[PDB]
Paper text:
Survival of motor neuron (SMN) functions in diverse biological pathways via recognition of symmetric dimethylarginine (Rme2s) on proteins by its Tudor domain, and deficiency of SMN leads to spinal muscular atrophy. Here we report a potent and selective antagonist with a 4-iminopyridine scaffold targeting the Tudor domain of SMN. In order to understand the structural basis of compound 1 recognition by these reader proteins, we determined the crystal structures of compound 1 in complex with SMN, TDRD3 and UHRF1, respectively. In this study, we identified some low micromolar antagonists with a 4-iminopyridine scaffold targeting the Tudor domain of SMN, and compound 1 shows >4-fold selectivity over other tested methyllysine or methylarginine binding domains.
In addition to triple-ring compounds 1 to 4, SMN also bound to two of twelve double-ring compounds, compounds 5 and 6. Both compounds retain the imino group, which pinpoints the importance of the imino group-mediated hydrogen bond in the compound binding and is consistent with our crystal structures of SMN in complex with compounds 1, 4, and 6. None of the single-ring compounds bound to SMN, which may not be able to provide strong enough π–π stacking interaction to hold the compounds.
Numbering used by the authors: 88 to 147
The structure:
Amino acid sequence: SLQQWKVGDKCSAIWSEDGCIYPATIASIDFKRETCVVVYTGYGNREEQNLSDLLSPICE
Ligand SMILES: Cc1cc(=N)c2ccccc2n1C
Ligand SMILES: Cc1cc(=N)c2ccccc2n1C
């Protein structure tokens, strides 16, 4: 990908606990590890995602 994900980007992510997709924002990126932390919109919980697993915001 030419464009890089950055902190503050809106995305969708698969929640580890149920396998369903939810809207999220990137809070941090580990440039070497190609991982990030996402904050789930409305729930407010956060968890690690590989950058390669982030989706553009669903149904937007
Ligand atoms: C029920 C529920 C509880 C959560 N704490 C949560 C967090 C992040 C994304 C989805 C989530 N859902 C669906
Ligand atoms: C739908 C979509 C897919 C992409 N891979 C992407 C990449 C970079 C910027 C916008 C993007 N959008 C909007």
